[PDB]
Amino acid sequence: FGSGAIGYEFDNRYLNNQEMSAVAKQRLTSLP
Amino acid sequence: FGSGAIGYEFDNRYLNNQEMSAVAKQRLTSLP
Amino acid sequence: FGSGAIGYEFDNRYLNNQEMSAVAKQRLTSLP
Amino acid sequence: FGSGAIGYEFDNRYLNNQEMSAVAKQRLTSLP
Amino acid sequence: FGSGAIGYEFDNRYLNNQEMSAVAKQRLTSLP
Amino acid sequence: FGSGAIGYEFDNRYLNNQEMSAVAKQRLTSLP
Amino acid sequence: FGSGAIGYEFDNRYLNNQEMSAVAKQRLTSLP
Amino acid sequence: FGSGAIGYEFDNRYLNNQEMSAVAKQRLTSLP
Amino acid sequence: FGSGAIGYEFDNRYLNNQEMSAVAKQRLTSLP
Amino acid sequence: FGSGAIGYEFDNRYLNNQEMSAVAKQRLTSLP
Amino acid sequence: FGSGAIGYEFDNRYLNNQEMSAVAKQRLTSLP
Amino acid sequence: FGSGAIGYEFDNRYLNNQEMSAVAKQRLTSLP
Amino acid sequence: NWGSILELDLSKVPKGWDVGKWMYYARVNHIAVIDSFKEGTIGASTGKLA
């Protein structure tokens, strides 16, 4: 059968987690 | 058969652990 | 067949282990 | 059947997260 | 056939090793 | 069936991400 | 067929190795 | 069917990214 | 067919390498 | 069917990449 | 069919490589 | 069919790269 | 105007010694036996305290 109201949310949440992991590594460096 | 009252909560918990891992790497830096 | 009284506990324990691993990385930084 | 209005955006989001992870490791060094 | 008197203990031991790995990363920091 | 106007772009984008990850590690060293 | 006198020992040895790896990371910190 | 005008270039690009990753770890050291 | 005079020793060697890797991370610390 | 004039080159190139990665870690140490 | 004069040597060589990797991490520490 | 004049050399090369990676981590330490 | 004041910590007076007699013998001999391994110094010796 099919219904994607819980698969969609879990995939979106996984991508949100991975996005937060990506942006959490960003730094604006110093000591030039 | 079908029932998601145990798989949904386990998936949610997995994504919550991923959430906490992602946000635990967030740092507001110093030494500019 | 089916009975999930040992699968449920092992999945819950796995998620507990992963949660403890996640929260064990948390730090409140210093040197501002 | 066939429909890519949900898989396309998830793939695009995955590649966007990969994009941000790749460009977050870019550093212009100092101390020459 | 069926018997879980050897798989249950191995799964429990695996999760115990995961437990010890998770709690071995716990640190109470210094230098505030 | 077949049409590769979205598979091609996603593979090319994946390779672009991996290329950016590769070149982002390049450094011209100092302190000789 | 079946006989688990060598599978049991190898699984137990694998778990012993993983346990030794876990406990080998344990430290009692200093510098408070 | 058969055609390698798109798989060949993607494989070549993958190996080029591996090439750049491998040669980006090359360092001529100092402090002897 | 069946014979474990070559698989048993390879498994034992694999677990011996795991043994040596596990015990090679063991350190008795200093600076208390 | 079969023809290995492109499989051979890609496998050889993969092994070349892995060899360059291996030798790029080699160092002749100092500070004795 | 079967003949294990090349499988045996390759498995033994793989285990030798993994053993050398294991023992190459061993250190006798200092600074007590 | 069967022929190992190309797979044997690729396996040997893979194990040679593993050999070089294993022996490239070998260090004779200092500061005792 | 009063003279210099020394801040003295008695964390190393030996066990079973009263402060008064310890300071008395410190006066007389100019040498005061101390105990660097008192139970109260366990943290600093063992790295648990500063």
Side-chain angles (χ1 to χ4, degrees), chain C:
Chain C
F1 323 112
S3 173
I6 286 169
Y8 180 89
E9 85 176 14
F10 281 147
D11 289 334
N12 195 62
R13 199 155 150 64
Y14 181 92
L15 297 161
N16 281 334
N17 290 318
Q18 183 193 80
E19 183 178 1
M20 266 193 311
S21 296
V23 298
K25 312 294 281 189
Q26 300 173 350
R27 174 191 150 81
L28 290 86
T29 64
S30 173
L31 172 83

Side-chain angles (χ1 to χ4, degrees), chain A residues 3-25:
Chain A
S3 173
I6 286 169
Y8 180 89
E9 85 176 14
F10 281 147
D11 289 334
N12 195 62
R13 199 155 150 64
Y14 181 92
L15 297 161
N16 281 334
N17 290 318
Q18 183 193 80
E19 183 178 1
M20 266 193 311
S21 296
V23 298
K25 312 294 281 189

